[PDB]
RNA sequence: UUUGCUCCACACAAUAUAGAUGGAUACGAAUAAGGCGUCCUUGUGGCGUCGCUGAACCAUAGCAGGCUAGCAACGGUGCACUUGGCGGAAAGGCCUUGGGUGCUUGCUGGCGAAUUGCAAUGUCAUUUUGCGUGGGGAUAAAUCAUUUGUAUACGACUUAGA
RNA sequence: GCCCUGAAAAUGGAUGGCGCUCAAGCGUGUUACCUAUACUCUACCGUCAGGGUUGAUAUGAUGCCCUGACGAGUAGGCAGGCGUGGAGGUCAGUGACGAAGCCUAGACCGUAAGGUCGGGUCGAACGGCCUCUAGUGCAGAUCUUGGUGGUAGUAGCAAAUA
RNA sequence: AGAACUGGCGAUGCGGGAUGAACCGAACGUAGAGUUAAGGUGCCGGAAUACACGCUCAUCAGACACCACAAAAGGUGUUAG
């Protein structure tokens, strides 16, 4: 009778996509990334910094 | 504001009951609305719908 | 924040002023303008003269009487340029105009009491240093006002009577200032010093 | 359509309105420019 | 001792409106001192009360009251929309009103 | 417009059977975001080679941040603006802290001195003119002297309140 | 005694008077839609008598309910009255205007010992 | 009923400018008053304290008559009559008061203040 | 509603009164530790002409 | 006209509010310049200082502010007198001398407050008038009617009449 | 580019007005802000549509209930309702202890047509429901008949000597 | 005056264009809250006497579509080129 949406109601948010229990504790949406910091070619930079 | 694709509030066009006040004929109908809503048989649906037809759609067989 | 905001007129620019003074009335705030002949207007003298002359020829045909009355008194000018800035035809507008009082020079009541100023209207806080402005009293006189002299005479009187009051206040301020100088350095004055005073 | 034959208007407008003056004694709207140097003399009078 | 104001001086300006259609269901008050929508927020909720004097005395007073409450900021000069159990008179545009400090959040 | 961003967008027609790996074209575009950047890209591109969004693709679209975002520099400019009359070429100079802001000052100077909307404006030769004396306009040649200095006459202290009690000074 | 009735709203309380029912005394206050081609009230302008739309219909939950959550039912004589012996909480007995001052008192006497709410318990109650 | 009527000085004591002297209207009124004063005597009242309380004169059935206007048209010549009626009352003194006591309905915090007030003083 | 207003005849509970001091003393002994706090408390509140509760601090 | 009329101090009823709820807190002139202090040889001077808002200054603690005890100062100060002066631009206000009288939160005490029950403006301003107090003061005219003609359609105007 | 000139018409006069001159102008870019019967959520009405539901020792399955959408509208079409005269039936209906009618800035119901009640007035019939029936609903028609205004105590009642 | 396509108006209110059948926005059950469109935010009037770059001085300024008209031709006025 009432369209209680998720996003601002953790109770319904779990009544659909039960993965929001695991997503919570795991954090996930904020989980860090790997610093596989490589290097961009010398060409890339001289063409990006052209006149 | 809505760009109606279709003509709003179409009264369907089909009959929902016999235009007559034939008490007995109205009983058969209440008998068949039931059958056509519980038996599930396609037969009752046609027979029910068939009671609502005027004398020009109930030709003398 | 006070019941009456006596507003000094000198330097102010008609329109700008007229507007804030008009919003303060339609807000309940009571107001009284003073020195309306020291009131300035944008544009040079000759322009503001033609503009009054192009309004001076605007009267009702069949009866120059029931026509648009052309007031020459600086107070009434600034006022007509404030009327158009209020719904004076409604009771509310009629009412707001009864909170307003525009005076030439500075009459007896509004002289013993402090008059303020509106920065957002003032000439020397607007007009790009260089543009030619116009003094009201000057224009008005050249369009019917016949009391230019009478005021210059009275304010001259008041300015000297006031200058004498401030001279007493000049030494009286320095008087208490000198007592406040030695009262400082004391244990009760240094207590407030840390308490932001 | 114009007047046809321009002719001086009848009457002086600066003498309006032609209403019955308030009092029988014509008020003296203005008196001579004051001369602070002469004897203190009178400026008008009341005749018949 | 001489002052006892536990509220703030607000002025009832005009009703929420357009160029030619005012909606009396909502008013607009210019609170004393407030001038920004950020610092206006601290007044939201604060039950408002327009106090006026009547001739005929009711349950026991000749000074009846109109209750309201700030509902939201409005504009950029610290004005706030207010609603009352019964919308305001209109004869009160330029009438000093009272903004209390409750419900208090501090 | 907003705060520009000198985007770098390269396109290269589209890999056709006969001509695979087509000569890429790099355009140093200006705009307030990326889509305006791309649009403006074909816009100029199709005004050089028979190539438009339908026949081509957007290789890469990387932004281009200023070299020394705190190094006040002189700028040289060449603009191909279409005035109401027809179209003209010109060279203005805007000494500022970056290409992006100097071009922002330019565009609004194009709207003030020659009423030309961003739409009737093509930005040609735009680079930082190295040494002075290379400054062809005196209005820039001005702020280029031995340890300059100047006052700010008539300060106009903007008021917060409606009324004052202290009639305003303009000393600085 | 009235069954728990939801807050009775009305949406529009001001009666719908014919347009100009004030201008001319001939034009009765009785509502009538303006069929006119130029009629401003029909064209529905900004500031003219709001016409009776169906949208002003009342909550079927509170339609016919008088201020005391009771639907009023006209009562002729006592025989007619006892139709409410089993609905003292839903209806209110309304004595008709053609009921004698003597008969009314008999009806009230019956309606009181039955627990019915007579809406007009003052009709011809001359002391 | 005074449009185009003449002006007169005698109408100053009332505050108007228009005032006529309806000799007939008066003779029928003072003539009828004569009758009122006489009814008061046979009813036994004070000929002094007597004053007119209610005097109402309204339209009567217009006496019909005709007049001939040019081109042989017949325009009416109505005779608007009256229906005067009045009441001479004995003038009584003391308007009196006979005011209502007024049942006060003050709230508990409205009594409290009255209680706390008459608690510091009398 | 039959006396209105015939004073009290209902004032206070000797209990409630004594219970005050039972606590009053406890805090009173706490207030004479912080200077002027007794004065600050025997003092009422009020907003001054040029007092802003939003840009204020308590 | 039986004592009507008016001014003051009140007293109580009526009365309304374009809207008190700490204080409208007085140079002038300038603004590509000023204020303030101060110095001399007094100037369109020298020197110091300040501004960047009133976000100031004043007021402000006490049953809307009570009852008492003082301490220290003799200041501040409210009301009502009083002295002298100033102000006519709408002066109707500002300044002053001296008594009086209440308070003083500049410092320290002691009592009081509750039940308005967990908020309900929670009533404290000033406007007008009326009816009753007793206390001063003052004893007219206008209009109509008559009259005139410098006036006039009528009103109006202008004269005259104990 | 801005600006000046080129730029002459009749009642006084219109960037809408006032007024605006580092604008409240012209150009531009940035924000925040404002408010339509539109958009979003919700409540209520109605229409439409899709379904549910005999169910027992109860009362409407042209019933109750759930569900979704939509609502402008002259000419016009249809459907559902309100009202009036009279007809068959019905309430063993109302009534001289006051019917009908009329009055009522008195109350209630209905979106509405209208219905209902109190008070007043009044004096002899009348109403609800089920059907039947029609000379069945008025603001116009330079409508008919009758009646009454403003006009207006106005025009004017002035030839024939008095 | 007469055609084409489309949209309107007619028949359609509403908010803006001061004002207006046709333009901008937008289509109407009755309410509430929110958010906007169009258009605007000195005062009239709800909304910044907001921000920034500039240009402009007119003894006949200029002021935002339909829209309430202005030109060819001139200016050592000034700005930029």
Note the CA–C1' distance, B25 to K62, in angstroms.
14
Q: Chains with 3 or more CB pairs closer than 8 angstroms to G?
A: none
Q: Please measure the distance between the N-terminal and C-terminal CA atoms of chain G and give it in whole angstroms.
A: 28
Give the residue among C4, C3, C9, C16 at the shortest CA–CA distance from C33. Answer: C9
Domain boundaries, chain H: 1-99
Phi-psi region of G91 (alpha: psi -120 to 50; beta: other; left: phi over 0): beta
Task: Please tell me the total count of domains within chain E.
Answer: 1
Structure determined by: cryo-EM
DSSP characters over C177-189: HHHHHHHTTSTTH
Distance from E16 to chain C by nearest Cα, in Å? 15
Distance CA(A48)–CA(F61), nearest Å, equals 10
User: Would you identify the CATH topology of the domain F70-146?
Assistant: Ubiquitin-like (UB roll) (3.10.20)
Residues of chain F with CATH 3.10.20.10: 3-69, 70-146
* CA C161 to chain centroid: 20
Helices assigned H by DSSP within F22-122: 34-45, 99-112
E88: number of Cβ within 10 Å? 23
User: Would you tell me the crossing angle of helices B42-51 and B23-38 to the nearest 10 degrees?
Assistant: 160
Asked if F132 and F144 touch (Cβ cutoff 8 Å), the reply is yes
Asked if F100 and F5 touch (Cβ cutoff 8 Å), the reply is yes
Beta bridge partners, G72, equal G92
Torsion sign over Cα H45, H47, H51, H52: positive
Distance CA(H110)–CA(H21), nearest Å, equals 65
Asked if the C-beta of F28 comes within 8 angstroms of chain A's C-beta atoms, the answer is: yes
Q: Are strands F25-28 and F8-11 parallel, antiparallel or unpaired?
A: antiparallel
Distance CA(C182)–CA(E33), nearest Å, equals 36
Segment (H or E) for C134:
strand C134-135
Residue D17: is the preceding peptide bond cis (ω within 30°)? Answer: yes
DSSP characters over chain E: ------SEEEEEEEEEE-SS-EEEEEEEEEESS---STTTGGGTT--EEEE---SS--SS-S--EEEEEEEEEETTTTEEEEEESS---STTTTEEEEE---S---
Show residues of chain F in contact with A51, CB under 8 Å.
Answer: 28, 127
Note the CA–C1' distance, E11 to J137, in angstroms.
49
Note the CA–C1' distance, C182 to J54, in angstroms.
26
Distance CA(E16)–CA(E74), nearest Å, equals 10
Asked if F161 and F118 touch (Cβ cutoff 8 Å), the reply is no
Torsion sign over Cα C8, C12, C14, C18: negative
DSSP characters over C138-194: HHHHTTT---HHHHHHHHHHHHHHHHHHHHHHHHHHHHHHHHHHHHTTSTTHHHHHH
What does the DSSP 8-state code read for residue C117?
B
Interface with H, mutate which of E59, E61, E62 (most H CBs under 10 A): E59
Give the residue among E1, E12, E21, E3 at the shortest CA–CA distance from E70. Answer: E12
Report angle CA I52, I54, I56 to the nearest 5 degrees.
60
Sorted by sequence, the CB contacts under 8 Å of residue G99 that are 6+ apart come out as G75, G76, G107, G123
Asked if G94 and G74 touch (Cβ cutoff 8 Å), the reply is yes
Q: Chains with 3 or more CB pairs closer than 8 angstroms to F?
A: A, C
Distance CA(F104)–CA(F111), nearest Å, equals 11
Q: CA torsion angle for F30, F36, F38, F41 (degrees, to 10)?
A: -50
Asked if the C-beta of I3 comes within 8 angstroms of chain H's C-beta atoms, the answer is: no
Residue nearest to nucleotide L16 (CA to C1'): E19
Show residues of chain A in contact with F67, CB under 8 Å.
Answer: 49
SS3 content of chain C, % helix, strand, coil (to 5): 50, 10, 40
Sorted by sequence, the CB contacts under 8 Å of residue C24 that are 6+ apart come out as C5, C31, F162
Asked if G14 CB < 7 A from strand K, the reply is no
Give the residue among C119, C18, C44 at the shortest CA–CA distance from F170. Answer: C119
DSSP characters over I6-46: ---S----HHHHHHHHHHHHHHHHHHTTSTTHHHHHSS---
The structure tokens listed for H91 are 């003038």
Specify whether domain F3-69 bears CATH 3.10.20.10. Answer: yes
* Listed resolution, Å: 3.5
Distance CA(F46)–CA(C78), nearest Å, equals 61
3-state secondary structure of H4: coil
Distance CA(H99)–CA(H94), nearest Å, equals 14
Distance CA(E21)–CA(G104), nearest Å, equals 54
Sorted by sequence, the CB contacts under 8 Å of residue D16 that are 6+ apart come out as none
Phi, psi angle pair for F96, to nearest 5°: -145, -160
* A13-16: long-range contacts, CB 8 A cutoff, minimum separation 24: none
Query: In angstroms, how far apart are the furthest CA atoms of chain H?
Result: 96
Domains and CATH numbers, chain C: 1-147 (3.90.1180.10), 148-197 (1.20.5.4280)
Among chain C residues, the shortest Cα distance to E29 is held by: C27
Among chain A residues, the shortest Cα distance to F65 is held by: A49
Distance CA(G75)–CA(G98), nearest Å, equals 11
Beta bridge partners, G93, equal G73
Query: Which nucleotides of strand L lie under 7 Å from a protein CB?
Result: 11-17, 19, 26-34, 42-61, 79-81
Q: Are strands F8-11 and E65-74 parallel, antiparallel or unpaired?
A: unpaired
Q: Who among residues 46-105 of H has its Cβ near strand J, under 7 Å?
A: 99
H, E, C per residue of G76-97:
CCHHHHHHHCCCCCCEEEEECC
3-state secondary structure of C6: strand
Asked if the C-beta of C94 comes within 8 angstroms of chain E's C-beta atoms, the answer is: no
Distance CA(C3)–CA(C30), nearest Å, equals 6
Note the CA–C1' distance, G53 to K78, in angstroms.
19
Distance CA(E93)–CA(E73), nearest Å, equals 19
3-state secondary structure of I3: coil
Asked if B2 CB < 7 A from strand K, the reply is yes
Distance CA(E34)–CA(E41), nearest Å, equals 10
Give me the CATH number covering residue E4.
2.40.10.190
Asked if C39 and C78 touch (Cβ cutoff 8 Å), the reply is yes
CB contact under 8 A, C120 and F167: no
Asked if B44 and B32 touch (Cβ cutoff 8 Å), the reply is yes
CB contact under 8 A, C116 and F159: no
What are the angstrom distances between the C-alpha of F42 and each of B17, F51, F103, G95, H5? 67, 8, 21, 88, 93
Q: Are strands F88-90 and C100-102 parallel, antiparallel or unpaired?
A: unpaired
* Domain span at E98: 1-106
Distance CA(B47)–CA(B60), nearest Å, equals 16
């Amino acid at each position: 009778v009432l369209k209680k949406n998720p996003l601002k109601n953790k109770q319904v948010l779990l009544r659909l996509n039960p993965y929001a229990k695991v997503f919570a504790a795991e954090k996930l949406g904020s989980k860090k990334a790997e610093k596989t910091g490589t290097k961009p070619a010398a060409v890339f930079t001289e063409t990006l910094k052209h006149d | 504001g809505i760009d109606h694709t279709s003509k709003q509030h179409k009264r369907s066009g089909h009959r929902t009951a016999p235009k007559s006040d034939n008490v007995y004929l109205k009983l058969l109908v209440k008998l068949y609305t039931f059958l056509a809503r519980r038996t599930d048989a396609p037969f009752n649906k046609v027979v029910l719908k068939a009671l609502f037809l005027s004398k020009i759609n109930r030709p003398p067989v | 924040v006070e019941p009456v905001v006596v507003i000094d007129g000198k330097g102010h620019l008609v329109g700008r002023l007229a507007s804030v003074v008009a919003k303060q009335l339609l807000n309940g705030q009571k107001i009284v303008v003073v020195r309306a002949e020291e009131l300035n207007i944008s544009g040079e003298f000759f322009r503001n003269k033609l503009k009054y002359h192009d309004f001076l020829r605007k009267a009702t045909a069949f009866n120059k009487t029931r026509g648009p009355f052309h007031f020459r008194a600086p107070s009434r000018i600034f006022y007509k340029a404030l009327r158009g800035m209020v719904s004076h035809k409604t009771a509310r507008g009629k009412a707001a105009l009864e909170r307003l009082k525009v005076f030439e020079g500075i009459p007896p009541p509004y002289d013993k009491k402090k008059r303020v100023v509106v920065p957002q209207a003032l000439r020397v806080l607007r007009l790009k240093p260089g543009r030619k402005y116009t003094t009201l009293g000057k224009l008005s006189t050249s369009v019917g006002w016949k009391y230019e002299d009478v005021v210059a005479k009275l304010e001259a009187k008041r300015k000297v009577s006031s200058a004498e009051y401030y001279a007493k206040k000049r030494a009286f301020t320095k008087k208490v200032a000198s007592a406040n100088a030695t009262a400082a350095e004391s244990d009760v004055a240094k207590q407030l010093a840390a308490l932001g005073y | 359509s114009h007047r046809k034959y321009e002719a001086p208007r009848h009457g002086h407008l600066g003498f309006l309105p032609r209403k019955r003056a308030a009092s029988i004694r014509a008020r003296v709207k203005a008196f001579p420019k004051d001369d602070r140097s002469k004897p203190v003399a009178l400026t008008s009078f009341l005749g018949y | 001792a001489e002052s006892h104001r536990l509220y703030v001086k607000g002025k009832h300006l005009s009703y929420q409106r357009s160029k030619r259609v005012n909606n009396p269901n909502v008013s607009l008050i210019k609170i004393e001192g407030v001038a920004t929508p950020q610092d206006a927020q601290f007044y939201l909720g604060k039950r408002i009360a327009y106090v006026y004097r009547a001739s005929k005395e009711v349950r026991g007073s000749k000074i009846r009251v109109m209750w309201g409450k700030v509902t939201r900021t409005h504009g950029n000069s610290g004005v706030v929309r207010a609603t009352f159990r019964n919308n305001l008179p209109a004869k009160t545009f330029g009438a000093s009103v009272r903004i209390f400090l409750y419900p208090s959040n501090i | 417009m907003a705060h520009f961003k000198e985007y770098q967008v390269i396109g290269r027609r589209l890999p056709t059977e006969s001509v695979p790996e087509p000569k890429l074209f790099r355009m140093r575009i200006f705009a307030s975001n990326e889509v305006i950047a791309k649009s403006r890209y074909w816009y100029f591109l199709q005004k050089l080679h028979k190539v438009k969004k339908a026949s081509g693709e957007i290789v890469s679209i990387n932004q281009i941040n200023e070299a020394h975002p705190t190094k006040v520099k002189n700028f040289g400019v060449w603009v191909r603006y279409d005035s109401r009359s027809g179209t003209h070429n010109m060279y203005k100079e805007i000494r500022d802290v970056s290409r992006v802001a100097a071009v922002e000052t330019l565009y609004q100077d194009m709207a003030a001195r020659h009423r030309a909307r961003f739409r009737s404006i093509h930005i040609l030769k735009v680079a930082e003119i190295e040494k002075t004396a290379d400054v062809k306009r005196q209005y820039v040649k001005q702020f280029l002297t031995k340890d300059l200095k100047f006052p700010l006459p008539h300060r106009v202290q903007k008021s917060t309140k409606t009324f004052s009690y202290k009639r305003p000074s303009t000393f600085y | 005694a009235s069954l728990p009735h939801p807050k009775i709203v009305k949406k529009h309380t001001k009666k719908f008077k014919r347009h100009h029912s004030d201008r001319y005394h001939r034009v009765a206050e009785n509502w009538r839609k303006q069929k006119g081609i130029d009629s401003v009230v029909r064209r529905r302008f900004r500031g003219n008598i709001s016409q009776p739309k169906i949208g002003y219909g009342s909550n079927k939950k509170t339609k016919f309910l008088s201020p005391s959550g009771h639907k009023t039912f006209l009562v002729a004589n006592v025989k007619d009255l006892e139709t409410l012996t089993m609905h003292t909480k839903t209806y209110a007995a309304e004595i008709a205007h053609n009921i004698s001052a003597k008969n009314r008192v008999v009806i009230l006497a019956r309606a009181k010992a039955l627990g019915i709410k007579v809406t007009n318990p003052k009709g011809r109650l001359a002391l | 009923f005074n449009s185009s009527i003449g002006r007169t000085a005698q109408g100053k004591e009332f505050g108007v400018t228009k005032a006529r002297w309806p000799a007939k209207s008066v003779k029928f009124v003072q003539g009828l008053l004569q009758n009122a004063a006489a009814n008061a005597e046979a009813k036994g009242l004070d000929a002094t304290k007597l004053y007119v309380s209610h005097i109402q004169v309204n339209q009567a059935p217009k006496q019909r008559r005709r007049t001939y206007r040019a081109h042989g048209r017949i325009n009416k010549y109505e005779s608007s009559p009256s229906h005067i009626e009045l009441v001479v009352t004995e003038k009584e003194e003391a308007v009196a008061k006979a005011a209502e006591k007024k049942v006060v309905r003050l709230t508990s915090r409205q009594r409290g203040r009255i209680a706390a007030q008459k608690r510091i003083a009398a | 509603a039959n006396l209105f207003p015939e004073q009290q005849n209902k004032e206070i509970k000797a209990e409630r009164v004594e219970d005050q001091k039972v606590v009053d003393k406890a805090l009173i002994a706490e207030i004479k530790k912080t200077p002027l706090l007794k004065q600050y408390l025997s003092a009422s509140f009020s907003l001054k002409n040029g007092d802003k509760p939003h840009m204020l601090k308590f």
